Amino acid sequence: PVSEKQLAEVVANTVTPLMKAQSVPGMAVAVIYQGKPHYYTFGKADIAANKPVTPQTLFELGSISKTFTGVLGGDAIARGEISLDDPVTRYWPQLTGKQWQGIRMLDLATYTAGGLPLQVPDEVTDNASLLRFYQNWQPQWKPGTTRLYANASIGLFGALAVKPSGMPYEQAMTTRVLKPLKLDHTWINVPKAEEAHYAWGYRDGKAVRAVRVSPGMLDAQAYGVKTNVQDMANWVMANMAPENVADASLKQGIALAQSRYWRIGSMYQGLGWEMLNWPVEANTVVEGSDSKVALAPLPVAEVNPPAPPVKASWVHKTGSTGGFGSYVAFIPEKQIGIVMLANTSYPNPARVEAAYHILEALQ
């Protein structure tokens, strides 16, 4: 087995050339191995202020935020508040357009509603306009036939999933997922006293941060989660080993998020999380991460009933914002995982290659 000394070498030997090649100012990495996190920090959180990355530095997760949504929605299912087999309209009766008949909460959660686009457009600036957008939407495909990765799909799922609880998404997420897991430095809105920890993002040499979008049911999902490498490490450990999560509905929700709902070539869609069977070769994972594939509308095979979590899985998610690029992957059968948080958005294939190389060293 690999020692902590050897692991430190592997991580440094992988990350240092990556940051140079991709011009990454700073990275925080956690590797989960032998039951605990191992933390490695590199570079700068703020170039001009010459602030180093630390295990307290906050990074924008981008679409890794969807894994929190997925688990929150799984928790709501486990509570009995929603069912993935319910129609969307059960949770939004004002959505009267008949094109919605036969579209389930499942389809919104897993991008199979039939062509909801990647983005909610910017003229959506309130809920009246959000309704008009979904009412006007004309599906390109029937439900349950085509996967098209989409913020307009899972974002609406997350907004509807929390409606029975009576809480907005941010409060539901904080109350039901973050606090029970002691993720006490994980934020949608970074508090005042925590801003000194917030890294700057970098894009073509310019320091940038995520902007808030227009107030409405999706605003928190869109502004996205910010967190440090410690909380992300503990997020990965909770998802890798939900048997240690005490709250019964949250443990079930973690499992629902890693269940397989659809097969799309070599991958399977969960709630936010995506999975491949393990063992998997690097090129499979890397090639799937290319935007020409990841953004494409692709046919699905339904997994009916959904398959509960498969321990021999590569479970992962990439996420980016204008200034940040992050990746998380874990293998429950092996009880190993990795978090890589960076303050530049560098190519997803490069993220996967580096993560794969590090985890390969530990098996």
From Swiss-Prot:
Q: Fetch the SUPFAM superfamilies from UniProt.
A: beta-lactamase/transpeptidase-like
Keyword field: Antibiotic resistance, Hydrolase, Periplasm, Signal
* EC id: 3.5.2.6
Q: A single Gene Ontology molecular function, please?
A: beta-lactamase activity
The GO biological-process annotations, alphabetized, read as:
antibiotic catabolic process; response to antibiotic
Per its record, the protein catalyses: a beta-lactam + H2O = a substituted beta-amino acid
Glycosyltransferase found in the keyword field: no
Cellular component terms, GO, for this chain's entry? Answer: outer membrane-bounded periplasmic space
The impact of changing residue 344 to K is: In strain: MHN1
Where, in this chain's numbering, is substrate bound? 317-319
Q: Which InterPro entries match?
A: Bact_CellWall_Synth/Modif, Beta-lactam-related, Beta-lactam/transpept-like, Beta-lactam_class-C_AS
Protein origin, superkingdom: Bacteria
Q: Give the active-site positions.
A: 63, 149
Q: Does the keyword Ion transport apply?
A: no
Which compartment or compartments is the protein found in?
Periplasm
Q: What does this protein do?
A: This protein is a serine beta-lactamase with a substrate specificity for cephalosporins.
Q: Which family does it belong to?
A: Belongs to the class-C beta-lactamase family.
Something else the entry says is:
The sequence shown is that of strain P99.
Would you tell me the protein name for this molecule? Beta-lactamase
Organism annotation: Enterobacter cloacae
List the taxonomic lineage.
Bacteria, Pseudomonadati, Pseudomonadota, Gammaproteobacteria, Enterobacterales
